[PDB]
Structures are given as structure tokens and as C-alpha cells.
Amino acid sequence: ASLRDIKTRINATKKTSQITKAMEMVSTSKLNRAEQNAKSFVPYMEKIQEVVANVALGAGGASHPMLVSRPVKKTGYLVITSDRGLAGAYNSNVLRLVYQTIQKRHASPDEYAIIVIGRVGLSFFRKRNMPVILDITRLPDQPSFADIKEIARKTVGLFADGTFDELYMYYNHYVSAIQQEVTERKLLPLTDLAENKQRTVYEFEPSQEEILDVLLPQYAESLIYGALLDAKASEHAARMTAMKNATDNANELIRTLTLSYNRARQAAITQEITEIVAGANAL
């Protein structure tokens, strides 16, 4: 190529490298904060898990704990995706699994419905012809308890009014900065409990089975947090890793382009001086 073209390429690559480095440095702090939020969530999850594992087996039944709800019908799918790209395979990894499961174990656009979080998954499903019932798009990078309260309550209500048979949720679980695992979790009917000391409740009972009608919808907030906090942590870690990889690639390209530029410069100088000397001695 020519010197001017190589110089322009170098300048563009340097600008891209700086932008990616800034994005990586932001994403590192965002991931660090998301880890603290996930840590803060722990004790409430622990206490509610214990109290549910105790009470829900209290010699009774309800729509949520039974092995089968209203006879097998439309299955509910809840998927959590980011609202913006540049996160690597973060969205695609979950979307491929969801697509495979839907196409393989239903084979009909009648016995399933999809609830999406994030713009990317919504666009992915709307590019195809799969029905979406509910969705939320723009969220804080560090959501608080009331951010997705309405969507979670509506998702529970869709099972409550018999519209859904069961709920499956898909998301990215945070394991390490470089490894995030796609996870499928059976949400409703919950169908499993913790093996704890079942009698330790001592709740002043208004009604031992009526309390379940309030507890189970609130225990359902495993969907809102136990998955979403991991999803946000995985999203930030994926952004950080993708941005550092992009920065490294840009630096390598800059090095190679600089070598090419220096070779071209030397060749140009040699050719110019040779032509000048030939013209001078041709006289």
C-alpha cells in the first residue's frame, strides 16, 4: 500500500484501541460492583430458602408445589439477555440453547410462550416468528429490589391464572472472568426443596396453608434475582474480556502496520534519491 493509506489505517486503529481500552476499564469496575451486589443479596435468599423448605412441606398442597399443574399445556420460557452488544457470545450462547429446546421438544408454536429481558433477545425472537408475551428492555447496571417487581409479579400471575403449565429460565451464570456457563433452571412448578429441619418455623399461624399463598409468590423472586444478578455479572465480565481481547488485537495490528510503514518509507527514500542521482549524472 501507500504511505498515506498506511498512516490513516494506523490512526484509525489507534483510536479504536483507545476506545476499547476505556470500555474495558469501565467494565472492570462495573463487574466489581455487581459482585458486591450479588454478595449483598445472599442472606435474604438463605432465610427465604430455609423458611420455604420448612413450610411448603407442612402436610398440604398448592398449585405451585404440586408435581403437575393444570394438565400439560403451554410451557413458559424466561430468557435474560443484555440490552447492548459488544459482549462476545453472551447473548448467542443462551439464545442457541433456547432455540434448540423450543424447536426440539415442542415442534409447534402453540404450546410455548417466551418472556424476554433485554433488547437483544427481543430482536432475536422477533426476527423469527416466535410469540413474546412480556418484556422489559432498559434497566440500571445495578438494579434495585423494585426494578423488575412488576414483570416478576406478572410472570408469577401468568402461572397463577392457569395460563402456563411450567416455567423454565435461561441465563448466563458467572463462574470466572473468562468462563460463563449457560444455565437452564426449572422455576415453576418448583418441584424441589432443601433438606432441612422442617419443623423450625414457630410462625404465629393465621392459617398454615393460607400463608403459602403469600409465601410462594414471594419465594418466586428467585427468578428476579438469583438469575439476574448472575446475568449482570456475566455480562460485565464478558464485556471486559471482549474489550481487552479487542485492544490486544488492535495493538498487534498497529505493530505490523508500523513495520510496513517503515519499510515503505525506506523504499520511497531510496527510489527518490536513485532517480535524482540518475537524472543528475545523465547530463
Next chain:
Amino acid sequence: ALAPEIVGEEHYQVARKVQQTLQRYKELQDIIAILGMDELSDEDKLVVHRARRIQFFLSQNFHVAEQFTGQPGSYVPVKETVRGFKEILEGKYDHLPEDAFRLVGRIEEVVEKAKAMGV
């Protein structure tokens, strides 16, 4: 000689389609280098998927290469070449690994490979 009245209509069309796919793949190279395939669209990813396999299938094992590597050479008729590239373009072998297309003759040899290894 690459003219429809000399090589045939389907031969000409297959050649032009292969060249178009390779040109698109070459255009995608800088984006792929900078930030990988994660930000490509669905059609661009399919173009890359087809183009890598086409580029690998363009390789061949020569008779005179017996001295460098023990693999015997192969002679491929133009009809077999056209049929194989047409089949690759139609998407018949999108599930095979791209390493199975290296240094073979007919598409039957690509099919026989990836059986000595995982299918």
C-alpha cells in the same frame, strides 16, 4: 475460457457464486481480525461458514507430493469438482468440521473423513 458458452451454464454460475462468497469473506476480514465474529450478523456468519469450507475444499493432494507426505495424490474430474462445489454452496455439508475438507479429492473423500474422527 471462463465463459458460459465454453464451460456451460451451471459451471459458470457455480464459479461466479464461489467467487462472490470468497469476495464477501475477504471484505469481512478486517472486522473479524479486530473484534471477531461475535458482532457479525446472521447472514455474515453463514457467509463465513460457507467460505472457510470452500477455501479448504479448494486444496488438493498432489501425486508429486507423495515425497513430502505419505498421502497419495488424486485426480478430480471437472464434473465432480462442479458437483462438489454446488453441494457445498447448497448447504449439504454445513455440519461437518472444516478440517475434513483439507487436501482431498472428491466430496466423497470429505464424507469419508470426519468418520475416522468424530462425525
Next chain:
Amino acid sequence: ALAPEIVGEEHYQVARKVQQTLQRYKELQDIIAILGMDELSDEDKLVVHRARRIQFFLSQNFHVAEQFTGQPGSYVPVKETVRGFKEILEGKYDHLPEDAFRLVGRIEEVVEKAKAMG
């Protein structure tokens, strides 16, 4: 000349270990700046702790700088500097303050300076 054939196996090993420690410390600068010192692991803490000692011990008080400082210069033999760096790598002086290693000569002058500080 940094090859065991002419400089000595112990000298080569000490130099390689010092360079590795310095490179390891250099790699952590961005994460230390972003998250902070307390966010590192224990081994990273030890690496930073020892590397900040090595960086300071690489300095020296020159004879020609006496006219400006008042501190006399020093001439450090290669055996002395090799042994001092080996001792620092072994962790013999991890409890000493880091500023004691700033502008001293042999490995005993740092001890004397630290004792003078308290």
C-alpha cells in the same frame, strides 16, 4: 554477558528471578489502580511487597552526588549485590520498611538505616 557460562549459575538465577518478579509487579499496575491494593490475592500482595523492595534496592548513592546530598558514595561488588538480592528474594527482610532500601549500598546499610529510623 547474562549467561551462566561466564557470569555464574547463581548470578544467572538471581537475575532471572529478579526480572520475573519485576515483570509480575508491572503486570498488576492497571488492576491495582482500578480496584485498589486490598482487592488483590495473597500471592499478589506478596509479589507487590517484595517488588517494591527490589525496585528501591536497585538504586544507589553515587560519589559524584555527594556535593549535592552530603551522603558519601558507595562501591558495591558483584558478589555483595548478588547476595543482597538473593536475601531480599528469600524474604529475609520483608518486615523492614521500604524506604530503608532507597539510597543505600550493601545489604547491611539498609539494616543500619532502618534501625536509625526506628
